[PDB]
Design a protein around this ligand. Structure first.
Ligand SMILES: CC(C)CN(C[C@@H](O)[C@H](Cc1ccccc1)NC(=O)O[C@H]1CO[C@H]2OCC[C@H]21)S(=O)(=O)c1ccc(N)cc1
Lengths: 99, 99
């Protein structure tokens, strides 16, 4: 499909058997999701943007479905104000910018 | 053009008669540029990102050309980690997400 940018590009995703709303974000290197209790091991990480850095938990090879498009890759989990789908997964669903 | 997301979607912009590199950022409502000298009046504003809130200078009705496409809109100037082009200007150049 095609998504215009008049409003925030929020879409439904499926992760760990849960449906959430997330932002398709070309400015995010990696996917970061609001606090959630995923199982498995993880690695500490810090990611930075406007305002500074937050601490997150890095989970690897996590399956996520974005608009019915399946993907698998790194998912960060932490106190982000919003669920963010980053380039690491946007590439996997064939997402491009067009103008 | 069609821009894939394996690398950061960095493009050259022209603002205040000066060339700069900036990130096309569909997750940003607004356009935020690193510290620079812009002519005309400005108002102090606050904006929040993943790590909290920063103080910025708001310039309205600024001419800015993004990858050969002209836009006239609001540009925030402050301590952002990188020049980001947000939806307020992405809409003006006709940018959409496609997958
Ligand atoms: C600043 C960018 C280089 C990086 N950011 C993605 C960006 O899209 C954020 C994503 C974002 C969106 C909402 C809230 C927090 C973060 N947007 C943002 O900061 O925009 C601000 C300017 O316009 C306003 O609209 C949104 C917030 C303001 S980030 O959220 O900090 C980020 C950094 C690293 C990763 N792996 C994932 C995300």
């Amino acid at each position: 499909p095609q998504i215009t940018l008049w409003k925030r590009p929020l879409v439904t995703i499926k992760i760990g058997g849960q449906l959430k709303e997330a932002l398709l974000d070309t400015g995010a290197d990696d996917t970061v999701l609001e606090e959630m209790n995923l199982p498995g091991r993880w690695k500490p990480k810090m990611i930075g943007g406007i305002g500074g850095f937050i601490k997150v938990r890095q989970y690897d090879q996590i399956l996520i479905e974005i608009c019915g498009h399946k993907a698998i890759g790194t998912v960060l989990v932490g106190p982000t104000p919003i669920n963010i789908i980053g380039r690491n997964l946007l590439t996997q669903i064939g997402c491009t910018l067009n103008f």
